[PDB]
């Protein structure tokens, strides 16, 4: 079995403004993103999206999809279910909230089917209880009989999905078990079934949470199926190239200051909407005794806290996922909410120095523009 393309959208929502906050979607999404990439999926991973952002991300995902393409959606965050319809709850939902504030998974399925995907996979790592404030009784249109649909729900209808309250890293229950199986060369339905068995052995979740699989898939399609890669339309290749650009951060640039010092500006991706910037004092003409380099003046859209920027360790920025994957001895800054970027990312590298003999500090600073960062390119 071969797939014309494999494409995944992964969303983790943790920091709700009007509802309890979550911790593990960041690990779940990060680790799943990596496993999917090992299977050659073109993946977009996004943290903490609003309703508007979630819809836009879905619109981008849909653009990738084409006849024969395997599409996968993974969601870790708050959700609800009314009348067998699954809804994803964005971080900007009010309390209480209604369906119009959320995204209905089935509608996404309908749109995917309109693209003639070869496989539709939904992994919904969220609660499935009712939202009683939402009183609407939607007449969702009947889906076409694709025979390509697989739902892996972290929990059963009417029940809850969980993560572990452990300080430091810990997956949610679903990912805890999924990640050990995900790379298996098996029909995705069978794989999920093994996953359901693994979860059943969890004492902590017994009687509270169990995987539910819903499938109408009539062919031996596996996540490990090879990409055919022969029939791309030119428009697709450009879309693929654009996706690759979103996937790739700007390469590091060496900044030359008028006073002759050089600073290394380095970039790392945590998610498609989360970048880490690091700076280091690579070079000094001797005449200058002391050097200080630091970053600032970010776009407001990013809502970056200067208290939380220019840190000794990546860990200090709220970047726990990437470390020791980053050059040591560098200031670190975490740019999250990259999707909120109206204008090319522009910021300021500032430098403070004293010359040997001279005793007064000098202040020089230059605007760097990497322009669009990651996901932002997509539009």
């Amino acid at each position: 079995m071969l797939a014309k393309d494999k494409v995944a959208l992964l969303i983790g929502n943790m920091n709700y403004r009007e509802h309890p906050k979550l911790k593990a979607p960041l690990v779940d999404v990060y680790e799943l993103t990596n496993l999917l990439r090992q299977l050659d999926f073109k993946v977009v991973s996004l943290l903490d999206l609003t309703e508007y952002e979630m819809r836009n991300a879905v619109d981008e995902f849909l653009l990738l999809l084409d006849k024969g393409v395997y599409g996968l959606l993974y969601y870790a965050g708050h959700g609800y279910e009314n009348f067998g319809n699954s809804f994803m709850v964005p971080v900007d939902a009010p309390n209480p909230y209604r369906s119009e504030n959320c995204l209905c998974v089935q509608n996404i399925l309908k749109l995917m089917q309109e693209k003639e995907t070869g496989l539709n996979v939904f992994l919904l790592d969220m609660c499935r209880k009712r939202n009683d404030y939402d009183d609407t009784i939607p007449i969702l249109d009947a889906l076409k009989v694709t025979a390509n649909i697989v739902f892996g729900y972290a929990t059963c209808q009417g029940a809850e999905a969980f993560e572990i309250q452990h300080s430091g890293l810990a997956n949610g229950i679903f990912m805890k078990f999924l990640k050990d199986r995900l790379l298996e060369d098996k029909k995705i339905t069978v794989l999920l079934d093994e996953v359901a068995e693994d979860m059943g052995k969890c004492h902590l979740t017994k009687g509270k949470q169990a995987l539910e699989i819903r499938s109408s898939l009539s062919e031996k399609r596996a996540l490990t199926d090879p990409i055919q890669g022969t029939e791309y339309s030119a428009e697709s290749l450009v879309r693929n190239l654009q996706w690759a650009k979103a996937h790739e951060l700007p390469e590091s640039m060496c900044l030359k200051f008028d006073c002759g010092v050089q600073i290394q500006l380095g970039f790392a991706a945590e998610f498609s909407n989360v970048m880490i910037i690091y700076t280091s004092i690579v070079y000094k003409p001797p005449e200058i005794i002391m050097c200080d380099a630091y970053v600032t003046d970010f776009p407001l859209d990013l809502d970056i806290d200067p208290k939380d920027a220019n840190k000794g360790t990546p860990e200090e920025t709220g970047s726990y996922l990437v470390s020791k994957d980053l050059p040591k001895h560098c200031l670190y800054t975490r740019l999250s909410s990259l999707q909120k970027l109206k204008e090319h990312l522009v910021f300021t590298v500032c430098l403070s120095y004293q010359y040997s003999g001279l005793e007064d500090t000098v202040e020089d600073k230059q605007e760097v523009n990497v322009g669009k960062p990651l996901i932002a390119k997509l539009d």
Binding site: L22, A24, H78, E160, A161, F162, E163
Partner: peptide, 4 residues
């Protein structure tokens, strides 16, 4: 245990 955390609820989602």
């Amino acid at each position: 245990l955390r609820s989602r």
